[PDB]
Amino acid sequence: VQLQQSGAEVKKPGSSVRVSCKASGGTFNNNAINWVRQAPGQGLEWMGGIIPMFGTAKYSQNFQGRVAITADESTGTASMELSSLRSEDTAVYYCARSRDLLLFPHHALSPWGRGTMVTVSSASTKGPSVFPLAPGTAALGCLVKDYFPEPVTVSWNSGALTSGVHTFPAVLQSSGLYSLSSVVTVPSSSLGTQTYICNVNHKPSNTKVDKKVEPK
Amino acid sequence: ELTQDPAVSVALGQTVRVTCQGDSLRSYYASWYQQKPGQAPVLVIYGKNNRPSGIPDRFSGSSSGNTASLTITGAQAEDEADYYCSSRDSSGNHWVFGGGTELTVLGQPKAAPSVTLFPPSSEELQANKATLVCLISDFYPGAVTVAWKADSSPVKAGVETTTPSKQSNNKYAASSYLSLTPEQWKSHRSYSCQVTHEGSTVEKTVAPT
C-alpha cells in the first residue's frame, strides 16, 4: 500500500490549490487519508482527513472555512483543496494513511506520500537556464540557473545513474531567484567513452531539459 | 498540545531518550516519526511499543501518565534526524504534533570540505554571461564561509552563497556562485573560491586559459 502525490505547484495569493493523493492498489478500503503540511524548516501540522469509503471528513480549526477534502473511491484518489491562499501557506503537503479507528485504536499515520511542494507567491514564475559543468575520479555537473519557484529535480542518465550523484540545495539569490547545481563523481577513465546527461525538471515553468556533459 | 525538548545529543553506540508530554497522552498512545532532511516522515513507534515493518528493534516506546518516550539504543550515525511525537487530541477528532526534537549523534570525525570549482561553460559564455560555481561538500562540523578572489584580490560583488545544509550522511553541503561579465572572466589570470572551515582554508582556482 503506497501513496502517490501530484506534482509541485505555484499559486498566487487569494487563489486555491488542489493536491492529489492516489492509492497504489486502486482502493482506500477502510482507511482514512490525512493531510499534513510542513512549512520550510518547520514542524508538522495536521490539516484534516477523510474516510473515502464514506466520504466523511474532519478539519483542523486553523483552516476550517478554506479547506475541503474530497475523494473518488472508484479511482482510489483523494484531493485536498486549500483556498484563499496566503504566502504563509507555502509548504510541503503530505498525505498519510490511518487505519480504521475502532478496529485499530492505537495505530498511527503510515504510510506517507513523498509530499507535494506548494508555493504561494505573487512573484513571476521563471524557468531555469541549464548549463553543463565540464569535467582517479573527476567531477562533472549541471548548473541550473535563475529560476522561480522551488523545486527543481535533477536526475542523471534518466535515473540510470545514481551512485556518486550530489544535487545541492538551491541558493536563494538577492534577486529573489534560485540556482542549484548537481554534480556526479565518476572515474576519469570513463570521460572519453561514457555519456553523462543531466535531466532537469521544473514543473511550474513546464521545463524538462536534458544536457549532455562532455569534456571540454 | 504536545511538547518535546527541541534537541538532544547522544554518543555513538549509546542510548538516547526523547520525551513527549501533553494531556492528550492520557487518552491515546503517542506515536513517533523520524524525519531526515528533504524526506517525508517515517513512522517508527506506535501504541504500546509497536514497530512497523522494517524498523529495527533499537527503537522502542513507553508511556506514563501524560508523557511518552522514544528510546533508541545503540545509536547509529544514521539515526540522526528530527523526531516528532503525535497523537489524537483529547476529543479524538483530530491529530496533534509535538514541535519535534533534533537528535544529534556525536563522535562524528572532523572532516575537511571537498571543494569543486567550475569555470563558466562555453554555452553560458556564448549567451553572454559567466557564472563560476563553487561546490562544497562532506564537511563537519557544519560551519563554513566562502569567499572569492580575482587574481589575488578579494571580490565581494556578484556573489551568492548558501548557508550550510545537512547532507544525508550527516556531513554538510554548501555552494557559492560568482557572476561576471565574459569580459571580466577573460581579463584576469585566475579566479579563486576560498572556503574557510575550522581554521583551515581550501582554495581552488580556475583560469580562462
Author numbering:
A (entry chain H): 2 to 136, 144 to 224
B (entry chain L): 3 to 211
Question: From the publication, what sentences describe this entry?
Answer:
B-cell activating factor (BAFF; also known as BLyS, zTNF4, TNFSF13B, THANK, and TALL-1) is a member of TNFSF and a crucial factor for survival and maturation of B cells. BAFF is expressed as a homotrimeric transmembrane protein that can be released as a soluble homotrimeric cytokine after cleavage at a furin protease site. In 2011, the FDA approved belimumab (Benlysta), a fully human monoclonal IgG1λ antibody neutralizing soluble BAFF, as the first targeted therapy for SLE in the past 50 years since the introduction of corticosteroids and immunosuppressive therapy. Here we report the 2.05 Å resolution structure of the BAFF–belimumab Fab complex and 1.90 Å resolution structure of belimumab Fab alone for elucidating the molecular mechanism of this antibody drug against BAFF.
The crystal structure of the belimumab Fab fragment alone was also determined and refined to 1.90 Å resolution with R/Rfree = 0.167/0.206. Despite the absence of the binding partner (BAFF), the electron density of belimumab was clear throughout the entire structure of the Fab fragment, including all six CDRs. The elbow angle of the belimumab Fab, defined as the angle subtended by the two pseudo-dyad axes relating the variable and constant domains of a Fab fragment, differed by about 5° between the BAFF-bound and free belimumab structure due to intrinsic elbow flexibility. Structural comparison of the belimumab CDR loops before and after binding to BAFF showed little conformational deviation and minor adjustments in the side chains involved in the interaction with BAFF, implying that belimumab maintains the CDR loops in productive conformations prior to binding to BAFF, thereby contributing to the high-affinity binding.
